Amino acid sequence: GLGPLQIWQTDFTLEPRMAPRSWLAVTVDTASSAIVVTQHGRVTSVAAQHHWATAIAVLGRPKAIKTDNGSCFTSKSTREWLARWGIAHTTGIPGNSQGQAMVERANRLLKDKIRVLAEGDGFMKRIPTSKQGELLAKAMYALNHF
Amino acid sequence: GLGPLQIWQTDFTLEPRMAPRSWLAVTVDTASSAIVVTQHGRVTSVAAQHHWATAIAVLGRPKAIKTDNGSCFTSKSTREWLARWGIAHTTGIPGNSQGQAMVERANRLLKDKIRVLAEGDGFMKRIPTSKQGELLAKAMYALNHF
Ligand SMILES: [Zn+2]
Ligand SMILES: [Zn+2]
Ligand SMILES: [Zn+2]
Ligand SMILES: [Zn+2]
Ligand SMILES: [Zn+2]
Ligand SMILES: [Zn+2]
Ligand SMILES: [Zn+2]
Ligand SMILES: [Zn+2]
C-alpha cells in the first residue's frame, strides 16, 4: 500500500464565455490527475466551500488541499470549513513560484476545451446560459474520460 | 478483461425537504454501486439530460442506461440526446416488476441520509435553500465514500 498521496490542488480561473457564472473553480487530484470543475457568480470563501463539497462527493475526501494565498482560501470561514472536514491545507511556501503548476495547467486545458466545444456548437462569444452546464460537464468528461 | 458491464439505472424521486428543487435525479452505476444525484425544479426530458450530462462527467460514459417508462425518459428529445451520445437505453420488459430495484433502493437510502444529516444540522422541515447543495453533496459522499 505505498500508493500515491491524496493531495489536491485547487484554484479559480475566470472564463467570460460562462458569464454570468464566469468564475470556474477547478480542482486536480494530484494522485490520479482527475479534474473537477464548478461555476460560480463571484469568488468568495463560500464559493470555494461549495466547490470542495462537490469535489468531495466526486473524488472522496482528500488528506490535504494546496492552494495559492487567494483570500477566499485563507479566510477564517474557509479555515473553519476545512477543519470541520479534517482536511489539511497549505498555501505552499512564501513565494512558491511553482507547486501549483498542475492546476494552472488544468486551468488552461480546461478553457481551451470549452472554447473548442463551444465553437463546435456555433457559440463564438458567450455561451447561452441554458447551455452552459451541459457544456461545462462535457468539457469535464472530455478531460477525464472516466 | 471479463469485468462488469457498464450499465446504469436512473430514476427520479420526490423530496420535499429539498424544495423548491425537490425532484432528485439518481443514477446508480450497477458495475460499482456508485451513486450520482442532482436536484431539479421540475421533471422534464431536459432535467434527465442535465442529470446524465453530470453523471457522465462523474462516472464516464456508460454503454447503456435502464429506466422505467416515465415519459421524461421516453420522449423523442431524450431518445435523440442518448443517440447523440451513443448510449443505449432500455425501459426493461413490459411490466418489469423488478429490475429497477437497485436505483429504488438507492432512492430510499438517499432520502434517509438527507433526513438524518438535515436533522443533525437542526433542520426538521425544509432545508434552507442556501444549505441544500452542500447537504446534497454530503449525502452523496456519505453513500459513496469515494
Ligand atoms: Zn489563484
Ligand atoms: Zn455556491
Ligand atoms: Zn491561477
Ligand atoms: Zn470517453
Ligand atoms: Zn420512476
Ligand atoms: Zn437543469
Ligand atoms: Zn421510482
Ligand atoms: Zn469517507
Side-chain angles (χ1 to χ4, degrees):
Chain A
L2 312 148
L5 291 176
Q6 327 93 281
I7 298 171
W8 299 342
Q9 277 174 30
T10 302
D11 199 29
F12 271 90
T13 189
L14 188 53
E15 179 48 83
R17 283 175 130 98
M18 294 282 173
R21 294 158 71 219
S22 61
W23 274 114
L24 312 175
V26 185
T27 286
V28 179
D29 179 327
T30 64
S32 45
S33 268
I35 291 144
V36 179
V37 217
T38 52
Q39 283 178 267
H40 301 275
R42 208 309 188 190
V43 264
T44 53
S45 287
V46 180
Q49 304 165 15
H50 289 173
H51 175 67
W52 289 314
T54 297
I56 288 174
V58 170
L59 303 176
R61 195 185 201 143
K63 293 301 281 227
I65 299 178
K66 209 153 134 220
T67 72
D68 50 47
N69 292 84
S71 74
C72 67
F73 295 130
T74 69
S75 55
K76 262 293 166 197
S77 168
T78 289
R79 289 190 282 79
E80 179 53 26
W81 193 89
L82 286 171
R84 167 189 320 160
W85 275 90
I87 293 151
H89 180 235
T90 176
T91 63
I93 324 75
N96 217 2
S97 204
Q98 303 149 286
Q100 269 295 93
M102 284 197 86
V103 63
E104 295 300 355
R105 160 167 69 141
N107 283 340
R108 204 178 318 139
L109 293 176
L110 174 72
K111 284 154 74 206
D112 216 56
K113 189 58 82 159
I114 284 165
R115 172 183 71 68
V116 336
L117 300 166
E119 284 176 351
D121 288 328
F123 308 121
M124 310 305 148
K125 310 313 279 59
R126 201 178 62 89
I127 301 145
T129 299
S130 75
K131 311 281 169 58
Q132 294 173 5
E134 251 187 78
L135 198 144
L136 180 65
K138 197 184 331 164
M140 176 182 155
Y141 162 69
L143 299 164
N144 283 336
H145 285 271
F146 274 139
Chain B
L2 312 148
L5 291 176
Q6 327 93 281
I7 298 171
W8 299 342
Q9 277 174 30
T10 302
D11 199 29
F12 271 90
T13 189
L14 188 53
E15 179 48 83
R17 283 175 130 98
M18 294 282 173
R21 294 158 71 219
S22 61
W23 274 114
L24 312 175
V26 185
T27 286
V28 179
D29 179 327
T30 64
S32 45
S33 268
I35 291 144
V36 179
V37 217
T38 52
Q39 283 178 267
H40 301 275
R42 208 309 188 190
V43 264
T44 53
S45 287
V46 180
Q49 304 165 15
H50 289 173
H51 175 67
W52 289 314
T54 297
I56 288 174
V58 170
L59 303 176
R61 195 185 201 143
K63 293 301 281 227
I65 299 178
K66 209 153 134 220
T67 72
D68 50 47
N69 292 84
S71 74
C72 67
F73 295 130
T74 69
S75 55
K76 262 293 166 197
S77 168
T78 289
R79 289 190 282 79
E80 179 53 26
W81 193 89
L82 286 171
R84 167 189 320 160
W85 275 90
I87 293 151
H89 180 235
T90 176
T91 63
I93 324 75
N96 217 2
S97 204
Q98 303 149 286
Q100 269 295 93
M102 284 197 86
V103 63
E104 295 300 355
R105 160 167 69 141
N107 283 340
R108 204 178 318 139
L109 293 176
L110 174 72
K111 284 154 74 206
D112 216 56
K113 189 58 82 159
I114 284 165
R115 172 183 71 68
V116 336
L117 300 166
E119 284 176 351
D121 288 328
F123 308 121
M124 310 305 148
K125 310 313 279 59
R126 201 178 62 89
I127 301 145
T129 299
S130 75
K131 311 281 169 58
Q132 294 173 5
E134 251 187 78
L135 198 144
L136 180 65
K138 197 184 331 164
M140 176 182 155
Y141 162 69
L143 299 164
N144 283 336
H145 285 271
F146 274 139

PDB file of all heavy atoms in Angstrom, chain A residues 26-28 32-37 105-114 117 135-146, chain B residues 56-57:
ATOM      1  N   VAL A  26     -11.601  24.981 -10.054  1.00  0.00           N
ATOM      2  CA  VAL A  26     -11.015  23.771 -10.610  1.00  0.00           C
ATOM      3  C   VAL A  26     -10.108  23.106  -9.550  1.00  0.00           C
ATOM      4  O   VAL A  26      -9.273  23.728  -8.884  1.00  0.00           O
ATOM      5  CB  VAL A  26     -10.026  24.190 -11.767  1.00  0.00           C
ATOM      6  CG1 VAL A  26      -9.457  22.981 -12.476  1.00  0.00           C
ATOM      7  CG2 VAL A  26     -10.844  25.020 -12.763  1.00  0.00           C
ATOM      8  N   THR A  27     -10.372  21.816  -9.437  1.00  0.00           N
ATOM      9  CA  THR A  27      -9.550  21.017  -8.507  1.00  0.00           C
ATOM     10  C   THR A  27      -8.959  19.864  -9.305  1.00  0.00           C
ATOM     11  O   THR A  27      -9.649  19.252 -10.131  1.00  0.00           O
ATOM     12  CB  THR A  27     -10.363  20.458  -7.325  1.00  0.00           C
ATOM     13  OG1 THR A  27     -10.645  21.552  -6.424  1.00  0.00           O
ATOM     14  CG2 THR A  27      -9.624  19.345  -6.564  1.00  0.00           C
ATOM     15  N   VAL A  28      -7.678  19.611  -9.146  1.00  0.00           N
ATOM     16  CA  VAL A  28      -6.956  18.490  -9.740  1.00  0.00           C
ATOM     17  C   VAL A  28      -6.542  17.552  -8.589  1.00  0.00           C
ATOM     18  O   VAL A  28      -5.989  17.980  -7.584  1.00  0.00           O
ATOM     19  CB  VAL A  28      -5.616  18.855 -10.471  1.00  0.00           C
ATOM     20  CG1 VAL A  28      -4.939  17.587 -11.030  1.00  0.00           C
ATOM     21  CG2 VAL A  28      -5.849  19.804 -11.596  1.00  0.00           C
ATOM     22  N   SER A  32      -4.339  11.071  -9.250  1.00  0.00           N
ATOM     23  CA  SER A  32      -4.908  10.472 -10.446  1.00  0.00           C
ATOM     24  C   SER A  32      -5.042  11.349 -11.694  1.00  0.00           C
ATOM     25  O   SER A  32      -5.385  10.960 -12.814  1.00  0.00           O
ATOM     26  CB  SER A  32      -6.388  10.168 -10.105  1.00  0.00           C
ATOM     27  OG  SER A  32      -7.007  11.262  -9.446  1.00  0.00           O
ATOM     28  N   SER A  33      -4.839  12.638 -11.469  1.00  0.00           N
ATOM     29  CA  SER A  33      -4.999  13.684 -12.443  1.00  0.00           C
ATOM     30  C   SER A  33      -6.469  13.955 -12.777  1.00  0.00           C
ATOM     31  O   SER A  33      -6.689  14.770 -13.699  1.00  0.00           O
ATOM     32  CB  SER A  33      -4.135  13.501 -13.690  1.00  0.00           C
ATOM     33  OG  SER A  33      -2.911  14.223 -13.407  1.00  0.00           O
ATOM     34  N   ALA A  34      -7.404  13.383 -12.006  1.00  0.00           N
ATOM     35  CA  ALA A  34      -8.820  13.681 -12.263  1.00  0.00           C
ATOM     36  C   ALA A  34      -9.058  15.169 -12.016  1.00  0.00           C
ATOM     37  O   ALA A  34      -8.403  15.875 -11.271  1.00  0.00           O
ATOM     38  CB  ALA A  34      -9.784  12.836 -11.454  1.00  0.00           C
ATOM     39  N   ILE A  35     -10.019  15.749 -12.750  1.00  0.00           N
ATOM     40  CA  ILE A  35     -10.310  17.187 -12.596  1.00  0.00           C
ATOM     41  C   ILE A  35     -11.791  17.358 -12.250  1.00  0.00           C
ATOM     42  O   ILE A  35     -12.565  16.634 -12.864  1.00  0.00           O
ATOM     43  CB  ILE A  35     -10.023  17.905 -13.944  1.00  0.00           C
ATOM     44  CG1 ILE A  35      -8.480  17.825 -14.094  1.00  0.00           C
ATOM     45  CG2 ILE A  35     -10.437  19.362 -13.964  1.00  0.00           C
ATOM     46  CD1 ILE A  35      -7.981  17.641 -15.507  1.00  0.00           C
ATOM     47  N   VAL A  36     -12.042  18.298 -11.358  1.00  0.00           N
ATOM     48  CA  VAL A  36     -13.440  18.572 -11.049  1.00  0.00           C
ATOM     49  C   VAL A  36     -13.622  20.070 -11.256  1.00  0.00           C
ATOM     50  O   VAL A  36     -12.804  20.819 -10.718  1.00  0.00           O
ATOM     51  CB  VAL A  36     -13.780  18.300  -9.538  1.00  0.00           C
ATOM     52  CG1 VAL A  36     -15.253  18.640  -9.319  1.00  0.00           C
ATOM     53  CG2 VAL A  36     -13.639  16.795  -9.348  1.00  0.00           C
ATOM     54  N   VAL A  37     -14.665  20.484 -11.981  1.00  0.00           N
ATOM     55  CA  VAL A  37     -14.886  21.928 -12.103  1.00  0.00           C
ATOM     56  C   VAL A  37     -16.324  22.313 -11.746  1.00  0.00           C
ATOM     57  O   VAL A  37     -17.254  21.608 -12.119  1.00  0.00           O
ATOM     58  CB  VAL A  37     -15.019  22.377 -13.583  1.00  0.00           C
ATOM     59  CG1 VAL A  37     -14.383  23.722 -13.795  1.00  0.00           C
ATOM     60  CG2 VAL A  37     -14.788  21.316 -14.580  1.00  0.00           C
ATOM     61  N   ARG A 105      -2.093  24.397 -15.213  1.00  0.00           N
ATOM     62  CA  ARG A 105      -2.113  23.727 -16.485  1.00  0.00           C
ATOM     63  C   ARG A 105      -3.535  23.214 -16.758  1.00  0.00           C
ATOM     64  O   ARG A 105      -4.040  23.302 -17.867  1.00  0.00           O
ATOM     65  CB  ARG A 105      -1.137  22.520 -16.544  1.00  0.00           C
ATOM     66  CG  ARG A 105      -1.557  21.597 -17.665  1.00  0.00           C
ATOM     67  CD  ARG A 105      -0.846  20.468 -18.295  1.00  0.00           C
ATOM     68  NE  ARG A 105      -0.583  19.226 -17.601  1.00  0.00           N
ATOM     69  CZ  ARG A 105      -0.623  17.962 -18.040  1.00  0.00           C
ATOM     70  NH1 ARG A 105      -1.084  17.612 -19.242  1.00  0.00           N
ATOM     71  NH2 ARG A 105      -0.053  17.028 -17.262  1.00  0.00           N
ATOM     72  N   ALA A 106      -4.169  22.615 -15.739  1.00  0.00           N
ATOM     73  CA  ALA A 106      -5.541  22.179 -15.913  1.00  0.00           C
ATOM     74  C   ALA A 106      -6.411  23.387 -16.240  1.00  0.00           C
ATOM     75  O   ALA A 106      -7.344  23.260 -17.048  1.00  0.00           O
ATOM     76  CB  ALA A 106      -6.016  21.596 -14.581  1.00  0.00           C
ATOM     77  N   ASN A 107      -6.159  24.568 -15.656  1.00  0.00           N
ATOM     78  CA  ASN A 107      -7.000  25.751 -15.942  1.00  0.00           C
ATOM     79  C   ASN A 107      -6.962  26.034 -17.451  1.00  0.00           C
ATOM     80  O   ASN A 107      -7.975  26.248 -18.130  1.00  0.00           O
ATOM     81  CB  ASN A 107      -6.457  26.974 -15.199  1.00  0.00           C
ATOM     82  CG  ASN A 107      -6.787  27.025 -13.710  1.00  0.00           C
ATOM     83  OD1 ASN A 107      -7.728  26.332 -13.326  1.00  0.00           O
ATOM     84  ND2 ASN A 107      -6.083  27.771 -12.864  1.00  0.00           N
ATOM     85  N   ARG A 108      -5.760  26.029 -17.997  1.00  0.00           N
ATOM     86  CA  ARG A 108      -5.579  26.284 -19.435  1.00  0.00           C
ATOM     87  C   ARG A 108      -6.151  25.184 -20.293  1.00  0.00           C
ATOM     88  O   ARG A 108      -6.902  25.488 -21.254  1.00  0.00           O
ATOM     89  CB  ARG A 108      -4.096  26.428 -19.643  1.00  0.00           C
ATOM     90  CG  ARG A 108      -3.608  27.215 -20.854  1.00  0.00           C
ATOM     91  CD  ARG A 108      -2.074  27.235 -20.775  1.00  0.00           C
ATOM     92  NE  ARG A 108      -1.569  27.461 -19.412  1.00  0.00           N
ATOM     93  CZ  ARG A 108      -0.542  26.862 -18.797  1.00  0.00           C
ATOM     94  NH1 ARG A 108       0.198  25.894 -19.340  1.00  0.00           N
ATOM     95  NH2 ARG A 108      -0.194  27.220 -17.552  1.00  0.00           N
ATOM     96  N   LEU A 109      -5.941  23.891 -20.058  1.00  0.00           N
ATOM     97  CA  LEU A 109      -6.527  22.883 -20.924  1.00  0.00           C
ATOM     98  C   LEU A 109      -8.041  22.964 -20.885  1.00  0.00           C
ATOM     99  O   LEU A 109      -8.704  22.596 -21.826  1.00  0.00           O
ATOM    100  CB  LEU A 109      -6.253  21.507 -20.324  1.00  0.00           C
ATOM    101  CG  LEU A 109      -4.750  21.190 -20.357  1.00  0.00           C
ATOM    102  CD1 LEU A 109      -4.502  19.861 -19.669  1.00  0.00           C
ATOM    103  CD2 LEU A 109      -4.307  21.085 -21.798  1.00  0.00           C
ATOM    104  N   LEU A 110      -8.535  23.364 -19.695  1.00  0.00           N
ATOM    105  CA  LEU A 110      -9.978  23.439 -19.499  1.00  0.00           C
ATOM    106  C   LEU A 110     -10.571  24.552 -20.339  1.00  0.00           C
ATOM    107  O   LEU A 110     -11.585  24.341 -21.008  1.00  0.00           O
ATOM    108  CB  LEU A 110     -10.337  23.666 -18.008  1.00  0.00           C
ATOM    109  CG  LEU A 110     -11.815  23.891 -17.733  1.00  0.00           C
ATOM    110  CD1 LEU A 110     -12.673  22.642 -17.891  1.00  0.00           C
ATOM    111  CD2 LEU A 110     -11.986  24.362 -16.278  1.00  0.00           C
ATOM    112  N   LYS A 111      -9.932  25.728 -20.325  1.00  0.00           N
ATOM    113  CA  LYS A 111     -10.519  26.819 -21.112  1.00  0.00           C
ATOM    114  C   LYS A 111     -10.431  26.601 -22.622  1.00  0.00           C
ATOM    115  O   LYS A 111     -11.344  27.042 -23.358  1.00  0.00           O
ATOM    116  CB  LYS A 111      -9.936  28.131 -20.655  1.00  0.00           C
ATOM    117  CG  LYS A 111     -10.660  28.422 -19.319  1.00  0.00           C
ATOM    118  CD  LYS A 111      -9.734  29.298 -18.495  1.00  0.00           C
ATOM    119  CE  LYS A 111      -9.772  30.683 -19.128  1.00  0.00           C
ATOM    120  NZ  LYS A 111      -8.444  31.242 -18.739  1.00  0.00           N
ATOM    121  N   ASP A 112      -9.373  25.849 -22.990  1.00  0.00           N
ATOM    122  CA  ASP A 112      -9.249  25.548 -24.422  1.00  0.00           C
ATOM    123  C   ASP A 112     -10.346  24.645 -24.928  1.00  0.00           C
ATOM    124  O   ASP A 112     -10.872  24.742 -26.053  1.00  0.00           O
ATOM    125  CB  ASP A 112      -7.940  24.776 -24.633  1.00  0.00           C
ATOM    126  CG  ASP A 112      -7.352  25.208 -25.972  1.00  0.00           C
ATOM    127  OD1 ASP A 112      -7.187  26.467 -26.005  1.00  0.00           O
ATOM    128  OD2 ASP A 112      -7.077  24.384 -26.877  1.00  0.00           O
ATOM    129  N   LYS A 113     -10.637  23.624 -24.102  1.00  0.00           N
ATOM    130  CA  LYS A 113     -11.683  22.623 -24.467  1.00  0.00           C
ATOM    131  C   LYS A 113     -13.065  23.261 -24.454  1.00  0.00           C
ATOM    132  O   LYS A 113     -13.897  22.973 -25.310  1.00  0.00           O
ATOM    133  CB  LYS A 113     -11.579  21.487 -23.438  1.00  0.00           C
ATOM    134  CG  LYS A 113     -12.376  20.251 -23.703  1.00  0.00           C
ATOM    135  CD  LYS A 113     -12.053  19.595 -25.034  1.00  0.00           C
ATOM    136  CE  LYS A 113     -10.839  18.696 -25.049  1.00  0.00           C
ATOM    137  NZ  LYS A 113     -10.926  17.727 -26.217  1.00  0.00           N
ATOM    138  N   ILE A 114     -13.284  24.223 -23.519  1.00  0.00           N
ATOM    139  CA  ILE A 114     -14.599  24.911 -23.506  1.00  0.00           C
ATOM    140  C   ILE A 114     -14.738  25.691 -24.822  1.00  0.00           C
ATOM    141  O   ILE A 114     -15.737  25.578 -25.525  1.00  0.00           O
ATOM    142  CB  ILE A 114     -14.706  25.844 -22.300  1.00  0.00           C
ATOM    143  CG1 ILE A 114     -14.967  25.073 -20.996  1.00  0.00           C
ATOM    144  CG2 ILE A 114     -15.801  26.876 -22.462  1.00  0.00           C
ATOM    145  CD1 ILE A 114     -14.694  26.026 -19.845  1.00  0.00           C
ATOM    146  N   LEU A 117     -15.218  23.178 -27.729  1.00  0.00           N
ATOM    147  CA  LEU A 117     -16.540  22.593 -27.779  1.00  0.00           C
ATOM    148  C   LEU A 117     -17.570  23.686 -28.029  1.00  0.00           C
ATOM    149  O   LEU A 117     -18.568  23.399 -28.710  1.00  0.00           O
ATOM    150  CB  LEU A 117     -16.876  21.884 -26.476  1.00  0.00           C
ATOM    151  CG  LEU A 117     -15.987  20.722 -26.035  1.00  0.00           C
ATOM    152  CD1 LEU A 117     -16.266  20.366 -24.571  1.00  0.00           C
ATOM    153  CD2 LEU A 117     -16.232  19.521 -26.939  1.00  0.00           C
ATOM    154  N   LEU A 135     -22.400  21.935 -21.318  1.00  0.00           N
ATOM    155  CA  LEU A 135     -21.094  22.112 -21.976  1.00  0.00           C
ATOM    156  C   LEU A 135     -19.984  22.058 -20.933  1.00  0.00           C
ATOM    157  O   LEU A 135     -18.962  21.477 -21.290  1.00  0.00           O
ATOM    158  CB  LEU A 135     -21.041  23.449 -22.689  1.00  0.00           C
ATOM    159  CG  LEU A 135     -19.901  23.464 -23.723  1.00  0.00           C
ATOM    160  CD1 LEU A 135     -20.350  24.276 -24.921  1.00  0.00           C
ATOM    161  CD2 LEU A 135     -18.669  24.066 -23.090  1.00  0.00           C
ATOM    162  N   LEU A 136     -20.197  22.606 -19.726  1.00  0.00           N
ATOM    163  CA  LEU A 136     -19.135  22.508 -18.717  1.00  0.00           C
ATOM    164  C   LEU A 136     -18.935  21.045 -18.350  1.00  0.00           C
ATOM    165  O   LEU A 136     -17.813  20.504 -18.198  1.00  0.00           O
ATOM    166  CB  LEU A 136     -19.518  23.365 -17.493  1.00  0.00           C
ATOM    167  CG  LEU A 136     -18.458  23.317 -16.398  1.00  0.00           C
ATOM    168  CD1 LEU A 136     -17.141  23.971 -16.886  1.00  0.00           C
ATOM    169  CD2 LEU A 136     -18.900  24.147 -15.219  1.00  0.00           C
ATOM    170  N   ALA A 137     -20.012  20.286 -18.221  1.00  0.00           N
ATOM    171  CA  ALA A 137     -19.985  18.849 -17.947  1.00  0.00           C
ATOM    172  C   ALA A 137     -19.266  18.075 -19.022  1.00  0.00           C
ATOM    173  O   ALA A 137     -18.457  17.177 -18.784  1.00  0.00           O
ATOM    174  CB  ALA A 137     -21.380  18.238 -17.849  1.00  0.00           C
ATOM    175  N   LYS A 138     -19.497  18.404 -20.277  1.00  0.00           N
ATOM    176  CA  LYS A 138     -18.862  17.784 -21.436  1.00  0.00           C
ATOM    177  C   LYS A 138     -17.353  18.077 -21.461  1.00  0.00           C
ATOM    178  O   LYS A 138     -16.611  17.125 -21.817  1.00  0.00           O
ATOM    179  CB  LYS A 138     -19.506  18.253 -22.743  1.00  0.00           C
ATOM    180  CG  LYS A 138     -19.236  17.421 -23.983  1.00  0.00           C
ATOM    181  CD  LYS A 138     -19.814  17.983 -25.247  1.00  0.00           C
ATOM    182  CE  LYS A 138     -21.055  18.811 -25.232  1.00  0.00           C
ATOM    183  NZ  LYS A 138     -21.364  19.640 -26.453  1.00  0.00           N
ATOM    184  N   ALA A 139     -16.931  19.310 -21.123  1.00  0.00           N
ATOM    185  CA  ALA A 139     -15.516  19.591 -21.101  1.00  0.00           C
ATOM    186  C   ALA A 139     -14.814  18.777 -20.006  1.00  0.00           C
ATOM    187  O   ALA A 139     -13.651  18.352 -20.098  1.00  0.00           O
ATOM    188  CB  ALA A 139     -15.227  21.044 -20.756  1.00  0.00           C
ATOM    189  N   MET A 140     -15.530  18.658 -18.879  1.00  0.00           N
ATOM    190  CA  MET A 140     -15.003  17.932 -17.717  1.00  0.00           C
ATOM    191  C   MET A 140     -14.876  16.439 -18.053  1.00  0.00           C
ATOM    192  O   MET A 140     -13.839  15.798 -17.775  1.00  0.00           O
ATOM    193  CB  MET A 140     -15.830  18.194 -16.450  1.00  0.00           C
ATOM    194  CG  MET A 140     -15.319  17.360 -15.276  1.00  0.00           C
ATOM    195  SD  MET A 140     -16.296  17.610 -13.786  1.00  0.00           S
ATOM    196  CE  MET A 140     -16.013  16.051 -12.908  1.00  0.00           C
ATOM    197  N   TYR A 141     -15.866  15.855 -18.705  1.00  0.00           N
ATOM    198  CA  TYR A 141     -15.825  14.496 -19.214  1.00  0.00           C
ATOM    199  C   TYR A 141     -14.689  14.374 -20.238  1.00  0.00           C
ATOM    200  O   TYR A 141     -13.898  13.415 -20.179  1.00  0.00           O
ATOM    201  CB  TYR A 141     -17.144  14.268 -19.975  1.00  0.00           C
ATOM    202  CG  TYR A 141     -17.052  13.064 -20.908  1.00  0.00           C
ATOM    203  CD1 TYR A 141     -16.958  11.773 -20.393  1.00  0.00           C
ATOM    204  CD2 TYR A 141     -17.030  13.226 -22.277  1.00  0.00           C
ATOM    205  CE1 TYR A 141     -16.796  10.671 -21.212  1.00  0.00           C
ATOM    206  CE2 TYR A 141     -16.905  12.138 -23.120  1.00  0.00           C
ATOM    207  CZ  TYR A 141     -16.773  10.889 -22.558  1.00  0.00           C
ATOM    208  OH  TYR A 141     -16.768   9.795 -23.416  1.00  0.00           O
ATOM    209  N   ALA A 142     -14.593  15.332 -21.162  1.00  0.00           N
ATOM    210  CA  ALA A 142     -13.550  15.202 -22.193  1.00  0.00           C
ATOM    211  C   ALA A 142     -12.171  15.225 -21.556  1.00  0.00           C
ATOM    212  O   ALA A 142     -11.258  14.542 -22.034  1.00  0.00           O
ATOM    213  CB  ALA A 142     -13.612  16.219 -23.312  1.00  0.00           C
ATOM    214  N   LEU A 143     -11.941  15.926 -20.449  1.00  0.00           N
ATOM    215  CA  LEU A 143     -10.620  15.937 -19.872  1.00  0.00           C
ATOM    216  C   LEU A 143     -10.407  14.776 -18.914  1.00  0.00           C
ATOM    217  O   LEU A 143      -9.276  14.670 -18.461  1.00  0.00           O
ATOM    218  CB  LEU A 143     -10.247  17.226 -19.130  1.00  0.00           C
ATOM    219  CG  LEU A 143     -10.218  18.551 -19.886  1.00  0.00           C
ATOM    220  CD1 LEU A 143     -10.221  19.742 -18.913  1.00  0.00           C
ATOM    221  CD2 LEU A 143      -8.928  18.693 -20.670  1.00  0.00           C
ATOM    222  N   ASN A 144     -11.380  13.981 -18.538  1.00  0.00           N
ATOM    223  CA  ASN A 144     -11.155  12.881 -17.601  1.00  0.00           C
ATOM    224  C   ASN A 144     -11.390  11.516 -18.263  1.00  0.00           C
ATOM    225  O   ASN A 144     -10.644  10.590 -17.992  1.00  0.00           O
ATOM    226  CB  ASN A 144     -12.145  12.980 -16.447  1.00  0.00           C
ATOM    227  CG  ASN A 144     -11.875  14.016 -15.388  1.00  0.00           C
ATOM    228  OD1 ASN A 144     -10.775  14.476 -15.141  1.00  0.00           O
ATOM    229  ND2 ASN A 144     -12.887  14.424 -14.634  1.00  0.00           N
ATOM    230  N   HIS A 145     -12.448  11.433 -19.063  1.00  0.00           N
ATOM    231  CA  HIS A 145     -12.936  10.250 -19.764  1.00  0.00           C
ATOM    232  C   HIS A 145     -12.941   9.131 -18.719  1.00  0.00           C
ATOM    233  O   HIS A 145     -12.114   8.197 -18.778  1.00  0.00           O
ATOM    234  CB  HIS A 145     -12.100   9.786 -20.951  1.00  0.00           C
ATOM    235  CG  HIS A 145     -12.272  10.648 -22.158  1.00  0.00           C
ATOM    236  ND1 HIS A 145     -13.251  10.422 -23.106  1.00  0.00           N
ATOM    237  CD2 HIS A 145     -11.594  11.748 -22.574  1.00  0.00           C
ATOM    238  CE1 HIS A 145     -13.155  11.345 -24.062  1.00  0.00           C
ATOM    239  NE2 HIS A 145     -12.157  12.163 -23.753  1.00  0.00           N
ATOM    240  N   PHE A 146     -13.862   9.303 -17.762  1.00  0.00           N
ATOM    241  CA  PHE A 146     -13.776   8.343 -16.677  1.00  0.00           C
ATOM    242  C   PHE A 146     -13.800   6.872 -16.961  1.00  0.00           C
ATOM    243  O   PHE A 146     -13.162   6.207 -16.091  1.00  0.00           O
ATOM    244  CB  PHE A 146     -14.634   8.754 -15.492  1.00  0.00           C
ATOM    245  CG  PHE A 146     -13.806   9.680 -14.642  1.00  0.00           C
ATOM    246  CD1 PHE A 146     -14.355  10.813 -14.067  1.00  0.00           C
ATOM    247  CD2 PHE A 146     -12.480   9.342 -14.365  1.00  0.00           C
ATOM    248  CE1 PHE A 146     -13.595  11.630 -13.246  1.00  0.00           C
ATOM    249  CE2 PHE A 146     -11.709  10.154 -13.564  1.00  0.00           C
ATOM    250  CZ  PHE A 146     -12.274  11.285 -13.007  1.00  0.00           C
TER     251      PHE A 146
ATOM    252  N   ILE B  56     -22.263  11.641 -16.453  1.00  0.00           N
ATOM    253  CA  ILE B  56     -21.236  11.267 -17.441  1.00  0.00           C
ATOM    254  C   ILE B  56     -19.935  11.942 -17.060  1.00  0.00           C
ATOM    255  O   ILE B  56     -18.874  11.294 -17.142  1.00  0.00           O
ATOM    256  CB  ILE B  56     -21.678  11.625 -18.867  1.00  0.00           C
ATOM    257  CG1 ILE B  56     -22.802  10.716 -19.399  1.00  0.00           C
ATOM    258  CG2 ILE B  56     -20.472  11.537 -19.806  1.00  0.00           C
ATOM    259  CD1 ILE B  56     -23.366  11.120 -20.747  1.00  0.00           C
ATOM    260  N   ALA B  57     -19.899  13.190 -16.617  1.00  0.00           N
ATOM    261  CA  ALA B  57     -18.679  13.855 -16.243  1.00  0.00           C
ATOM    262  C   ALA B  57     -18.103  13.169 -15.026  1.00  0.00           C
ATOM    263  O   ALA B  57     -16.874  13.106 -14.873  1.00  0.00           O
ATOM    264  CB  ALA B  57     -18.859  15.357 -15.930  1.00  0.00           C
TER     265      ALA B  57
END
